[PDB]
């Protein structure tokens, strides 16, 4: 069914060497055993590889990168380390809901960079929030406004990449790449793999792990 260039599969969260607090979040949220994409996509992300994974919206996909990002987060460092992008505010808010639930036993702040936030709450949340989830436009407007510190960023997650691009966010996304440290891990999830998505993959990914179909 699935196709990957990564040859290690993990069928139980207990074998992923997750952080104790994180593991409690995973079971506490209702996760029992990893889904098919999770058994294949979680460890490569946790490990630093750029990742291209074809997956439809849902508890499996979102869990994949939310679980993986929380594991890479250094709880002490109170600054953005992971940046998640989603097609819309609602999708962004949903990701926040999930990540915060998986992080219920960890000291981690998740700020949503979307529309409706005054310049105040925006700057206060973006400063010490180790995980920032939002939409291309709001996120870029903040950087172009110099209200988003990216020097501590480690990973860049593009959720539902095909929908983001089909919405005319290529420019924001591309410009966002430039404002991130060269060393940042890149993760892209998309239900479909159209030209535009492949383009971004070859453009910003370094011999990435590929989980197709």
Swiss-Prot record:
Effect of residue 31 to A: Slow growth in vivo and reduces ATP binding and ATPase activity in vitro
Result when mutating residue 35 to A: Reduces ATP binding and ATPase activity in vitro
E.C. no: 3.6.4.13
Annotated GO CC locations: cytoplasm; cytoplasmic stress granule; eukaryotic translation initiation factor 4F complex; plasma membrane; ribosome
Single annotated GO MF: ATP binding
Principal location class: cytoplasm
Keywords: Acetylation, ATP-binding, Cytoplasm, Helicase, Hydrolase, Initiation factor, Nucleotide-binding, Phosphoprotein, Protein biosynthesis, RNA-binding
Reported effect, residue 61 to A: Lethal in vivo and reduces ATP binding and ATPase activity in vitro
Keyword ATP-binding belongs to the record: yes
Residue list for modification Phosphoserine: 66, 118
UniProt-annotated location(s): Cytoplasm
Effect noted on mutating residue 38 to E: Increases about 3-fold ATP binding but reduces about 2-fold ATPase activity in vitro
Phosphothreonine, modified sites: 62, 135
UniProt-listed GO biological process terms: cytoplasmic translational initiation; positive regulation of formation of translation preinitiation complex; regulation of translational initiation; translational initiation
Phenotype upon changing residue 55 to V: Lethal and dominant negative if overexpressed in vivo. Impairs ATP hydrolysis, RNA-helicase and translation activity in vitro
Binding positions for ATP per the UniProt entry: 55-62
Catalytic activity from the UniProt record: ATP + H2O = ADP + phosphate + H(+)
Influence of pH: Optimum pH is 6.0.
Miscellaneous comment as given in the Swiss-Prot or TrEMBL entry: TIF1 and TIF2 code for the same protein. Present with 106000 molecules/cell in log phase SD medium.
Entry note about domains: The Q motif is unique to and characteristic of the DEAD box family of RNA helicases and controls ATP binding and hydrolysis.
Family classification: Belongs to the DEAD box helicase family. eIF4A subfamily.
Complex formation: Component of the eIF4F complex, which composition varies with external and internal environmental conditions. It is composed of at least eIF4A (TIF1/TIF2), eIF4E (TIF45) and eIF4G (TIF4631 or TIF4632). Interacts with eIF4G1/TIF4631 and eIF4G2/TIF4632.
Protein name: ATP-dependent RNA helicase eIF4A
Location of this fragment in the whole protein: 12 to 224 of 395
């Amino acid at each position: 069914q699935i196709q990957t260039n990564y040859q290690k599969v993990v069928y139980k969260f207990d074998d992923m060497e997750l952080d104790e607090q994180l593991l409690r979040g995973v079971f506490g949220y209702g996760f029992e055993e990893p889904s098919a994409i999770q058994q294949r996509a979680i460890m490569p992300i946790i490990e630093g590889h750029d990742v291209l994974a074809q997956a439809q919206s849902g508890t499996g996909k979102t869990g994949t990168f939310s679980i993986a990002a929380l594991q890479r987060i250094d709880t002490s460092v109170k600054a953005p380390q992971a940046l998640m992008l989603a097609p819309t505010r609602e999708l962004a808010l949903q990701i926040q809901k999930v990540v915060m639930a998986l992080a219920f036993h960890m000291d981690i702040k998740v700020h949503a960079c979307i529309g409706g936030t005054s310049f105040v709450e925006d700057a206060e949340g973006l400063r010490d929030a180790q995980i920032v989830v939002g939409t291309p436009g709001r996120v870029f407007d903040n950087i172009q406004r110099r209200r988003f510190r990216t020097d501590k960023i480690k990973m860049f997650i593009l959720d539902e990449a095909d929908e983001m691009l089909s919405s005319g966010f290529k420019e924001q996304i591309y410009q966002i790449f430039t404002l991130l440290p060269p060393t940042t891990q890149v993760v892209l999830l998309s239900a479909t793999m159209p030209n535009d998505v492949l383009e971004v993959t070859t453009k910003f990914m370094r011999n990435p792990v590929r989980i197709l179909v």
